[PDB]
Design a protein around this ligand. Sequence first.
Ligand code: HEM
Ligand SMILES: Nc1ccc2nccn2c1
Length: 289
Amino acid sequence: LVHVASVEKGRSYEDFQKVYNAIALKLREDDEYDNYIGYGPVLVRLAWHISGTWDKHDNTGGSYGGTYRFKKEFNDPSNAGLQNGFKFLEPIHKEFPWISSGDLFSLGGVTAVQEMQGPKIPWRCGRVDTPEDTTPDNGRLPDADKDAGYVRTFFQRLNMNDREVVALMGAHALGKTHLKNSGYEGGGANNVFTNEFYLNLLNEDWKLEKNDANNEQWDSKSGYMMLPTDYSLIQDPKYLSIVKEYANDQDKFFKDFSKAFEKLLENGITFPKDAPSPFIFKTLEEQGL
Ligand code: HEM
Ligand SMILES: Nc1ccc2nccn2c1
């Protein structure tokens, strides 16, 4: 099963920077969402959930097809809450109807990371919408109530190794859990991309508690929380080494996250030899906008 990237006809860097800018300007404008977190974190989770359906074994799922737009995937219980991200992106898609769905969902995640002061994430165009029957079934995204061994095995399906997994999980610096969405009770409200996930894991006094949905999570006196799968990164000795590394080197985390996130967003896509190079978009700040 081969998905060849096909550049939206006649489009170039400038076209995609315009889309980036529209996203980034709306992110700035819609500042009240989710107790003033804004839409940055949900857009990052959207880009992850549309990519994280991928199966390396048969190349089903993945970001290429834009299949989140179809009800089976839209309605996946694992995707509860992401409708907010999709709604945010709808007027962008109306303004730029030439962009493919996969390109828009993935670019929304790139834009959010960068606008939240995260690393530059190189991004390639050419995802092509595929039909409804290519929508992967529900149940390919990960459970949160599980241990390090589960996390490790789960991520092998996405061709991610220990360092990639640990780096990617640093996105959990962003946003919060919502009991109605996932059965986890959120802590904090952060919308600035940092290595704080690792620092929190290592430095907080964690207590294993039950939340109002009767699920276990790790909570600290300072009001932070971790999923069991988050906390598993300091229970497993191989993950722990990497957590300590990112807790002590913001730049290394940024670089590794950028690589792993691009890879996640590109899994399943064959880029022709004469495809454009990855684009690195300027932030609104860098443009003086
Ligand atoms: C074992 C892997 C993972 C599990 C079990 C997991 C689980 C969760 C759960 C349960 C929530 C809360 C959803 C809600 O209640 O709204 C959450 C939020 C989030 N996740 Fe993950 N996640 C995982 C990996 C990742 C990865 C790899 C990324 C991105 C690189 C990511 C980015 C986020 C973001 C940005 C939010 C916040 C969204 C918001 O605030 O609206 N997650 N995730
Ligand atoms: N959105 C999320 C999801 C998990 C998490 N653990 C600590 C902070 N976190 C934020």
